[PDB]
Amino acid sequence: SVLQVLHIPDERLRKVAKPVEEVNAEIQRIVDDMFETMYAEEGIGLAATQVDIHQRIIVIDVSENRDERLVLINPELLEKSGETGIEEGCLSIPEQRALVPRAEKVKIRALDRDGKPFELEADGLLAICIQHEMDHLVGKLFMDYLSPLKQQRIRQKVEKLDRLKARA
């Protein structure tokens, strides 16, 4: 199922997710809808809190042909180093892009779809992704990194863009 993705200035985007208590079949069809919703909207990452499910689940797929879906359940950040930035977007901030300061290298622990723990070292687009998504789980959006001025115009451009969404 495709779920509805919240946009700013929705206050539910600012909620701190709870850790998943147990990875069962309820959890695994949250993951599936999250992937289906992600691909439907053409994103490379989606956090549960964006679909108004406030638990610690992130799906990511950077792939061309969808051969390596990545699931992070209860992600914890073990180490980071370096610094980069690319011009990021977000399904919850429609059509806006900004350079956000990120760590370049990141080591995480997490559970997969089967509740088995794995560790992942990531750089590049992956490491930027993981950070952006993990931010969602604690109520942080990428525009939070920007000047008060930069934030204003973002908020307005989006409001205008939904002004049309609910369309008629």
> Which residue's CB is nearer to Zn ion, number 27 or number 90?
90
As measured in angstroms, the least distance from the Cβ of 114 to Zn ion is: 25
> Which residue's CB is nearer to Zn ion, number 27 or number 135?
135
Q: In the chain, count H helices and then E strands.
A: 3, 7
Amino acid identity, position 73: I
34 touches Zn ion by CB under 5 A: no
Task: Write out the DSSP string of 118-158.
Answer: EEEEEEHHHHHHHHHHHHHTTT--GGGGS-HHHHHHHHHHH
Site for Zn ion (CB under 5 A): which residue of 60, 90, 127, 154?
90
Amino acid identity, position 144: D
User: Is the dihedral angle over the CA atoms 66, 67, 72, 76 positive or is it negative?
Assistant: negative
> Which residue's CB is nearer to Zn ion, number 8 or number 90?
90
Q: Give the 3-state secondary structure of residue 126.
A: helix
CA triplet 3, 138, 165: central angle to 5 degrees?
A: 35
Give the CB-nearest residue to Zn ion: 90
Active site residue 95: no
Binding residues for Zn ion, rule CB under 5 A, total 1
The answer to whether 136 is a known ligand-binding residue is yes
Choose the catalytic residue: 42, 64, 68, 133: 133
As measured in angstroms, the least distance from the Cβ of 25 to Zn ion is: 26
Could you give the residue numbers annotated as active site? 133
Give the interface with Zn ion as residue ranges (CB under 5 A). Answer: 90
